[PDB]
Write a protein that binds this DNA or RNA. Structure first.
Ligand code: SF4
Lengths: 158, 45, 232, 118, 226, 243, 124, 184
DNA sequence: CCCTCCCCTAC
């Protein structure tokens, strides 16, 4: 265990624990899990218009950093009011993390001798029609008959 | 056999002849008799 | 004239970054493919990675750098050890003395200069010692003269077009840093000495780019450990 | 030739990092391929700083043009009929680049048919 | 051009070069004009550098930018670099000539029937349980000569033919089928007539060239490594 | 089963996207792409067929008869043996027509639609009537409506090489697709013909199965190859390469 | 293309002998060092001007360009060996390129902001 | 000078503690609000606890620490293993500031420090559930009760009188389990 | 705006 220090003070224990936090949050009136409501990936589609239907107001926002509110301390949002004041010869870093080696490697790697049934017989016909008129029993005669008996359920083995 | 030995055996005693480049030799004349004969069976409009 | 200048700069930056990633084992060599077309005609058969997320990341980074190239006089790719946050290798693209004219150097001459510069880079990179797998990562650092970033979200402006959204993303995607922030703090027990190597650079009519590299090439234990594949 | 081909090779090898082929000497000095091979061999010597990787090919009796890679074991040594330095490479990867050559008077074997314009 | 071999006496004997197809390889399903243009400019650079020394005949291939039916029409005058305008002036067709995929070449009085090999590559895509080797391909070419037609598998080889050129009316001296897995040659005698059949391998894999002597009808091979 | 397969697929995809990602940007992009594809005509035309069963003798009047009843009656008029069975689904499509024309007045059968030279699917009618209402019903409970998304949706001649390359690429893509379709149809018809040469491609081309998407694809490919635009492209190619 | 630029570019290049491009001045220096070997040695005024230009380049945080020029001169001298070596011009050029150049690399370690951390180990 | 320093230090410490709490498992996910907040104009998500009582406790702790800043030399958030009472991890904020400097410099310094902290916490291995506990420990110079290593230096504020230094230390029986915290 | 007829589904 790491030593606290030569002269170290200890603060009071937090009110909640790992298991009591969700139960106390439910007791306070909030749901245990705040499932994400429908949102927009980019703020271009927000359209800056109220979302309502049949007198019911719907609050739709986006997860983009542009529409995310600043973190508030004491219930009041803290923000910068004065215009930025820069200095000459400033160096900057790109922040955003690239894909990892493992991710790229993983992507590359993947890419009864008793008759108790009913005998069955089926018939189909072919009739030579005239031009395009569909076969007609009164003018068109039958040229071919095709019959198939079901061998699975046919007894007597003739 | 080291490649240096092959290089000094071949490139050292080079011919350096018949390459004046002032009057290069003409390539052998090979003529296609069907060039202007036309009437190509496989020609489609 | 920046319609063609920006395209050539984009091609050069893409080839530069892909070559650095390929030759330093930042990503597995099997993903990289030798190619001439990568949505643009490349100067040579540069190896370009086929990972879609990596391609999008590199393209977005190049576009972000080009969007502020007027204030950027030096763009650098930093090679950082994963075991401990420390810059072990640094490749610098000097954009100072680069003409910024909006008003005829053609493409063949520009690509000849690019071929010479990239050939110099490849010749330098080949001699460097090999790097083990899954032990290194890369970073992008730009040296600007007069700009401030991360302060365009204080106005609570709502974006209405893709261009404005991209601008607000690029203005807040960077964090202020200090010079030689990732370097060791000069412990004094056989202090590391940074090693500087000069490389050739393109000198086309509109494009004047200088390039050089940096390397620790030293240490005081616990640095460059298990990253250079032992002796060879 | 002397003091000129060496300067051209040095410039094209170090001032700009580009592989140097003997056909480049052929186009530059307007000289025959055998003389170009001789100058390449001459430059291969008297060089203390071996900062380039010479690329050589072997011509066999069966006209098997082969790029020598192993540089230690060359199969069919008695079958080699010609051996010369094809190019000088400042890097491990060869990958040369080709462009339009104005071969006005560098031809050694011209074709029978002459070009007609308008 | 005689730079490599340096034996200018024997190299000068090669009067003409015949490119038998498959000059560029691409997938039509996913391809833009930029990459195809890059490859075509590379090919045009090669042609410009080699045309002053030798005459070249170009033949369409399967994956070349030409119609999928066997009677492929010649390469368009465009899709070539601007440096070839003099060669494409019209009067100088003895240096550069663009011909159809099946074409009869009367080279110095010797008739040569050449096809980029779609017919043989098309019969070989079937499974026939009644009969891939170099000897098998040569036997298939012999059968194509004996049957007196060039495209036995019409539904697979040729599209709708207006008004059949593939039914032979005259037997050539040399039969060339290109873009094959292997190289092979065989002399056949059908009805007292001698026909020489040559199987031209690809250059991308097994980068081998075939030298055809017109005087003795003997084919010798030249190989290039790396 | 009183709608079309395309609408079923679109609603299923939108609902799955909403339930999994909960991001409406993906739904908007997918819907806009689908609407653009429907407008441009890059659709199967098999997924835009209605199929509702009709009872010919169980209608109050000819005015109250369904849309499929009109198609069935027209087929009966052309041939009396084409009388449908009781409660049999009769497929039909709607086509572009004059303004104010009744929906039952268009009522194109698939056989008539495919053989029709200048028959075009009513993209506006489909996109509005068949797609917007169900999507609005499912998405108005969220607070958004898909109607806004739907309503929101010389020099070349000088460069001969680029133009000829683009024309060649388009033509070769169409030819390769048609060849693949013909090979598929020949392999399918091998079941009956048991032959691999000619007289089997003829039989394969004689197929007119309206339950197979390959038949629709082949008909569309043939129409594209024989279209006037293809003739225009060929004439332009000949003119460009006439130098 | 803005107000903070010192020239048509972001930074003002140092002009030597009415030359601005770095490739042009590099090739001029190479030609001068090739021609001055056969003259018995470069003139004192030319060497002083080159030293002044190198000092200006170093004071402007362009030590990479100074290293590039040093490497170019060293490579030219090495390639000139075995033909014009010890010819009364090679020795003086080598002595100058050592004494008046190599110590100059270890000066002006500034990057427009305080001084660079650690020490310089140039390729030379 | 001091006004902007305190004004932004409150938010910086709140984000500090909330990020440490969320990225470890002292409190479970789904009890934080990582979707509707931004810390210092950073592109990354910042989580804030949804329970008002815990938020009030954290804010009171921050205000108490800032009240005695002139006497406090160090401030750390100690990760303590349950059933062992051993400090597995520690995240110390060394203070060397002296009590001029514009608001922009302070904002940028805190933004960079927070970015470094987020990047460091994202790479740390996942810890299991109900096996972690946190404690706020402060050190006096020269609600409070008197009381192997793997150092990882992180960038703090150095834009003038602000000389805050940030670093973390490490080193347990089955507490750590390798396995993406935002994926649920 | 409202009514009637028709199609199809859920319990
Ligand atoms: S259309 Fe469908 S069914 Fe008719 S043949 Fe082609 S594949 Fe077989």
């Amino acid at each position: 265990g790491l030593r606290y220090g030569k002269r170290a003070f200890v603060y009071g224990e937090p009110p909640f624990g790992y298991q009591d936090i969700l139960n106390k949050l439910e007791d306070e009136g909030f749901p245990k899990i705040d499932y994400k409501d429908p949102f927009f990936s980019n703020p271009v589609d927000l359209e800056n218009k109220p979302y309502a239907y049949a007198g019911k107001r719907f609050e739709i926002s986006s997860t983009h950093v542009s529409t995310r509110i600043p973190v508030q301390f004491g219930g009041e949002t803290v923000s910068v009011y004065n215009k930025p004041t820069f200095d000459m010869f400033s160096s900057w870093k790109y922040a955003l993390k690239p894909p990892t080696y493992d991710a790229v490697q993983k992507w590359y790697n993947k890419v009864s001798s008793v008759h108790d049934s009913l005998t069955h017989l089926t018939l189909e016909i072919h009739a030579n029609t005239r031009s395009d008129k569909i076969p007609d029993p009164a003018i068109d005669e039958v040229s071919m008959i095709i019959w198939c008996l079901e061998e699975e359920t046919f007894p007597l083995d003739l | 056999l080291h490649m240096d030995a092959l290089l000094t055996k071949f490139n050292e005693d080079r011919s350096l002849q018949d390459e004046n480049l002032s009057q290069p030799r003409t390539r052998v004349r090979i003529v296609d008799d069907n060039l202007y004969n036309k009437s190509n069976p496989f020609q489609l409009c | 004239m920046n319609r063609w200048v920006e395209k050539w700069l984009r091609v050069y930056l893409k080839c530069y970054i892909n070559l650095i990633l390929f030759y330093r084992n930042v990503y597995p060599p099997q993903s990289f493919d030798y190619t001439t077309y990568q949505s643009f005609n490349l100067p040579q058969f540069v190896p370009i990675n086929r990972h879609p997320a990596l391609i999008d990341y590199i393209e977005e980074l190049i576009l972000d750098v080009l969007s502020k190239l007027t204030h950027v006089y030096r763009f650098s790719i930093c090679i950082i050890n994963k075991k401990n946050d420390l810059c072990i290798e640094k490749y610098v693209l000097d954009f100072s003395e680069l003409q910024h004219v909006d008003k005829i150097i053609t493409e063949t001459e520009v690509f000849d200069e690019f071929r010479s510069s990239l050939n110099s880079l490849i010749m330098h990179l080949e001699k460097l010692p090999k790097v083990n797998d899954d032990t290194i990562t890369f970073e992008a650092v730009i040296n600007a003269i007069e700009l401030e970033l991360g302060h365009k979200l204080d106005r609570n402006r709502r974006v209405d077009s893709l261009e404005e959204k991209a601008e607000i993303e690029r203005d807040s995607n960077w964090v202020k840093c200090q010079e030689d922030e990732n370097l060791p703090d000069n412990n004094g027990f056989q202090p590391p000495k940074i090693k500087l190597t000069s490389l050739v650079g393109s000198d086309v009519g509109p494009l004047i780019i200088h390039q050089f590299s940096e390397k620790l090439i030293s240490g005081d234990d616990k640095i460059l450990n298990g990253v250079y594949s032992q002796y060879e | 030739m002397d003091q000129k081909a060496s300067y051209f090779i040095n410039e094209k090898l170090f001032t700009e990092v580009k592989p140097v082929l003997f056909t480049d000497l052929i186009h530059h000095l307007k000289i025959g391929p055998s003389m170009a091979k001789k100058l390449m061999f001459d430059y291969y010597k008297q060089t203390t700083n071996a900062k380039y990787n010479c690329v050589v090919i072997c011509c066999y009796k069966d006209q098997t043009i082969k790029i020598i890679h192993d540089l230690s074991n060359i199969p069919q040594q008695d079958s080699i009929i010609d051996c010369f330095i094809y190019a000088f490479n400042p890097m491990d990867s060869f990958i040369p680049y080709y462009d339009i050559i104005d071969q006005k008077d560098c031809l050694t074997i011209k074709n029978s048919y002459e070009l007609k314009v308008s | 051009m005689g730079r490599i071999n340096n034996k200018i006496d024997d190299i000068s004997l090669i009067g003409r070069l015949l490119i038998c197809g498959n000059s560029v390889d691409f997938d039509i399903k996913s391809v833009n004009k930029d990459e195809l243009m890059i490859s075509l400019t590379e090919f045009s650079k090669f042609l410009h550098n080699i045309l002053p020394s030798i005459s070249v005949d170009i033949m369409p291939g399967t994956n070349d930018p030409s119609d999928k039916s066997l009677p492929q029409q010649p390469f368009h005058k465009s899709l070539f670099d601007k440096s070839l305008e003099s060669y494409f002036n019209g009067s100088n067709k003895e240096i550069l000539n663009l011909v159809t995929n099946p074409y009869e070449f009367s080279y110095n009085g010797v008739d040569v029937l050449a096809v980029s090999g779609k017919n043989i590559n098309d019969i070989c895509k079937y499974v026939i349980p009644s009969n891939d080797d170099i000897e098998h391909r040569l036997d298939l070419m012999e059968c194509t000569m004996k049957w007196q037609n060039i495209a036995p598998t019409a539904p697979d080889t040729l599209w709708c033919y207006p008004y059949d050129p593939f039914v032979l009316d005259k037997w050539p001296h040399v039969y060339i089928v290109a873009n094959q897995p292997y190289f092979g040659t065989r002399v056949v005698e059908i009805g007292g007539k001698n026909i020489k059949i040559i199987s031209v391998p690809e250059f991308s894999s097994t980068g081998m060239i075939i030298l055809l002597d017109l005087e003795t009808l003997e084919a010798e091979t030249v190989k290039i490594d790396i | 089963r009183d709608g079309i397969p395309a609408q079923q697929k679109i609603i299923e995809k939108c609902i799955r996207l909403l339930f999994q990602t909960k991001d409406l940007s993906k739904i908007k992009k997918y819907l806009q792409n689908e609407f653009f594809k429907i407008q441009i005509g890059k659709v199967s035309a098999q997924d835009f067929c209605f199929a509702k069963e009709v009872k010919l003798g169980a209608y109050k009047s000819e005015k109250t008869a369904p849309a499929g009843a009109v198609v069935v009656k027209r087929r009966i008029n052309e041939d009396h043996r084409a009388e449908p069975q009781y409660k049999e689904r009769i497929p039909y499509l709607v086509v572009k027509g004059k303004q104010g024309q009744l929906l039952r007045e268009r009522c194109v059968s698939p056989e008539e639609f495919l053989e029709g030279e200048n028959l075009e699917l009513d993209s506006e009618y489909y996109i509005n009537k068949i797609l917007i209402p169900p999507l609005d019903r499912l998405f108005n409970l969220i607070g958004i409506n898909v109607g806004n998304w739907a309503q929101e949706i010389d020099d070349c001649l000088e460069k001969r090489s680029t133009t000829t390359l683009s024309f060649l690429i388009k033509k070769l893509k169409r030819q390769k697709e048609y060849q693949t379709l013909k090979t598929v149809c020949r392999t399918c018809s091998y079941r009956y013909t048991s032959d691999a040469g000619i007289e089997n491609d003829h039989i394969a081309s004689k197929c007119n199965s309206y339950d197979c998407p390959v038949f629709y694809s082949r008909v569309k490919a043939e129409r594209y190859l024989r279209d006037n635009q293809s003739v225009q492209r060929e004439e332009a190619l000949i003119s460009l390469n006439d130098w | 293309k803005n107000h903070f630029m010192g020239q048509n570019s972001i930074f003002q290049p140092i002009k030597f002998q009415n030359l601005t491009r770095f490739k042009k001045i590099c090739q001029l220096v190479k030609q001068w060092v090739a021609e001055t070997l056969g003259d018995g040695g470069p003139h004192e005024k030319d060497v002083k001007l080159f030293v002044k230009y190198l000092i200006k380049l170093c004071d402007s945080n362009r030590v990479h360009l100074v290293l590039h020029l040093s490497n170019l001169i060293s490579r030219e001298l090495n390639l000139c060996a075995f033909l014009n070596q010890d010819h009364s011009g090679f020795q003086t050029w080598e002595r100058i390129l050592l004494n008046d150049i190599i110590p100059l690399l270890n000066r002006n370690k500034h990057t427009y902001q305080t001084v660079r951390k650690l020490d310089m180990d140039f390729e030379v």
